[PDB]
Amino acid sequence: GNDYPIVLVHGLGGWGKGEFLGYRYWGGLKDIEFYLNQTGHRTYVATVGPVSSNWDRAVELYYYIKGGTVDYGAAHAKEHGHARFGRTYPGIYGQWDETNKIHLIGHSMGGQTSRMLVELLKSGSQKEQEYYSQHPEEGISPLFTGGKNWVHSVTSLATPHNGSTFADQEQIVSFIKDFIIHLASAAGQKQESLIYDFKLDQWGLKRQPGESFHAYMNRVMTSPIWQSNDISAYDLTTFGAQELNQWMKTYPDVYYLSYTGNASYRGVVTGNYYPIGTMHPLFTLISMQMGSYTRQSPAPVIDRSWLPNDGIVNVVSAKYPFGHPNSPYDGAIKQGVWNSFPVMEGWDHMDFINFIGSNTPGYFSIYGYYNDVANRVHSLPK
């Protein structure tokens, strides 16, 4: 097969190690990346902005792997009104290129972020190229010139390719506050001692020296970025995600694999969908509104196929991006199409990363599922 290292890309809310002692995004109380590396699969955990745009996260993710200083694009930065340059990274895989390829594995928004990254690698950014032409004084970063075939495969796990009908209700500021409650609780850590980093430096939202966590977070959660386009909230809506699908291409020389979960069941009378008992309480009510939410207008149309969900991502959204090539898994993995594995019943949105309160139907451990996922991308031919 291949020897390409895996790179894990967290989704909305995701955090790096060193943010919670003893609690990892990938495994919770377990280290998945450690299990994969010990069992012979070189695996890297990448850390990008937990709540910024997929664009912001893809650029960050490039420099995280390759090494260098984050450049979000002069045109992008002007149009959306944040700083152009972000953090500086030494790179966890500097030799990354056409022959030293990598596998992108992304949970939740990380699947969108991975596709965004492949897009930027493959086709660059026309917008930034034109801005360079009009203003050669600004420069351009290699990531935006195009022509890099550095990603062998992209694997999404409960990724809202077509958005979330929860995100449509515009309560993600509220959701993330709640998330931060639940996350600190599950890490056994005091709210007052949290060093959770929202990574919104480009918007001038850095934690000030000696500033309390709660005052810093409130500065973030009241920021008007949450009503813009350059933010996770926007990208997670069904309109916003459909809009992204129009230009984040599915490339013919890349392997795409999708995994979808369902943790909802049809009510026999209402025909609505209700969360199962194993679901985390953070998603119980979200699942209930998603299980009962249909929308004729405005576009896109939300019909009854959208009612089943994993807690926060509808099943019909996680299988493949609408309009993109796709085949349900039939035993053979096809290149250049979305290979949609069968819905995994009983799996909630957080079960994929073994968040506390974990349930992994069909397996003894979240390790046994990642064993099969890693062996699967390892099997892809060169």
Binding residues for Zn(2+): 56, 76, 79-80, 82, 178, 230, 280, 348, 351
Write out the two tokens for 306: 């959208």
Q: How far apart are CA 148 and CA 381, in angstroms?
A: 19
CA angle 154-349-201, nearest 5°?
70
Residue 108: what are its φ and ψ, rounded to 5°? 55, -130
CA 87 to chain centroid, in Å, comes to 19
The listed partner (its own copies, Zn ion, none) that binds 191, CB under 5 to 8 Å by sort, is its own copies
- Residue 279, interface with its own copies (CB under 8 A)? yes
- Residue 54, interface with Zn ion (CB under 5 A)? no
Which among 10, 103, 107, 349 is annotated as catalytic?
349
The listed partner (Zn ion, its own copies, none) that binds 315, CB under 5 to 8 Å by sort, is none
C-beta of 98: minimal distance to Zn ion in Å? 28
Tell which positions 216-275 bind its own copies, by CB under 8 A: 275
164 to 203: interface string for its own copies, x by CB under 8 A: -----x-x-xxx-xx--xx-xxx-x-xxx-----------
- Residue 212, interface with its own copies (CB under 8 A)? no
- Residue 277, interface with its own copies (CB under 8 A)? yes
Sequence-separated (6 or more) residues with CB below 8 Å from residue 366: 27, 30, 32, 351, 353, 354, 358, 360
Sequence-separated (6 or more) residues with CB below 8 Å from residue 99: none
- Residue 294, interface with its own copies (CB under 8 A)? no
Nearer to its own copies, 119 or 310 (CB): 310
The sign one gets for the Cα dihedral 236, 239, 242, 248 is: negative
Helix (H, G, I), strand (E, B) or coil at 58: helix
Helix (H, G, I), strand (E, B) or coil at 151: strand
CA 312 to chain centroid, in Å, comes to 13
- Residue 381, interface with its own copies (CB under 8 A)? no
Using CB under 5 A, which of the segments 41-49, 285-293, 358-366, 374-382 binds Zn ion? 358-366
Is residue 108 among the annotated active site residues? yes
Count of residues touching Zn ion (by CB under 5 A): 8
Nearer to its own copies, 74 or 187 (CB): 187
Using CB under 5 A, which of the segments 43-51, 75-83, 149-157, 290-298 binds Zn ion? 75-83
116, 159 Cβ separation under 8 angstroms: no
Closest CA to 111 of 260, 229, 246, 266: 260
Task: Give the residue numbers annotated as catalytic, written as ranges.
Answer: 108, 310, 349
Residue numbers of the site for Zn ion (CB under 5 A)? 56, 80, 178, 230, 280, 348, 351, 359
